[PDB]
């Protein structure tokens, strides 16, 4: 659309492009939260929301938004993840550090599926903008506005999939139907992070610590 151009969503994606693997993952998440704010600011209409509503959407979505990014970054590698820091975590290291289960869910439900359908950066950008514009996020001053922004993003995504992949009539459906897996994996990653924090013995940097604070 002109309200929600797929060009601007792609531009936002392109603009942002210890043995313990869990330490390395936590360090990378902290760094990427700084980039995530700059990404959100490039999503059309995000910066016109109230500061309170911007805070609420980034606090609700940051986990899924980071997992979606590193998953799509990892379609080039086999049985591993590529972190934004440039470090790679192999499946064998993840299993050896006691996070094999969730690591395998990421590989099987997200990376392999993105790889299978060759999900492009315009499609990732849109799905991330749908996660961002979460009208269910608690305490929003105006859920309706966030709802209409989500609607503009999924209208933009569907016109993009029809235009670019006319031979794949199911492609739009297929993209949206990774969001429940992303939610479930998001929730399980959050529970891991809260446990790491609770037990100590994993360094957690200030921005990731702030996101784990319980108002």
């Amino acid at each position: 659309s002109m309200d929600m151009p797929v060009e601007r969503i792609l531009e936002a994606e392109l603009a942002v492009e210890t043995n313990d693997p869990v330490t390395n993952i936590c360090h990378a998440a902290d760094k990427q939260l700084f980039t995530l704010v700059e990404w959100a600011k490039r999503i059309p209409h995000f910066s016109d929301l109230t500061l309170e509503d911007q805070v609420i959407l980034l606090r609700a979505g940051w986990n899924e938004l980071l997992i979606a990014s590193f998953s799509h970054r990892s379609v080039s590698v086999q049985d591993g993840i590529l972190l934004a820091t440039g470090l790679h975590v192999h499946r064998s290291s993840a299993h050896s550090a006691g996070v094999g289960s969730i690591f395998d869910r990421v590989l099987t439900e997200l990376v392999s599926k993105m790889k299978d359908m060759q999900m492009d950066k315009s499609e990732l950008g849109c799905l991330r903008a749908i996660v961002l514009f979460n009208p269910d996020a608690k305490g929003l001053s105006n859920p309706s506005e966030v709802e209409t922004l989500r609607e503009k993003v999924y209208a933009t995504l569907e016109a993009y999939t029809k235009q670019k992949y006319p031979e794949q009539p199911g492609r739009f459906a297929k993209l949206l139907l990774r969001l429940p897996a992303l939610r479930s994996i998001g929730l399980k990653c959050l529970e891991h992070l809260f446990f790491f924090k609770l037990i100590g013995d994993t360094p957690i940097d200030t921005f990731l610590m702030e996101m784990l604070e319980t108002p």
């Binding site: 704010v37 600011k41 911007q54 200030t206 921005f207």
Partner: peptide
Amino acid sequence: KHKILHRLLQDSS
């Protein structure tokens, strides 16, 4: 507070 997130969002320059 959410100090850091507020400071990063406000920051424009």
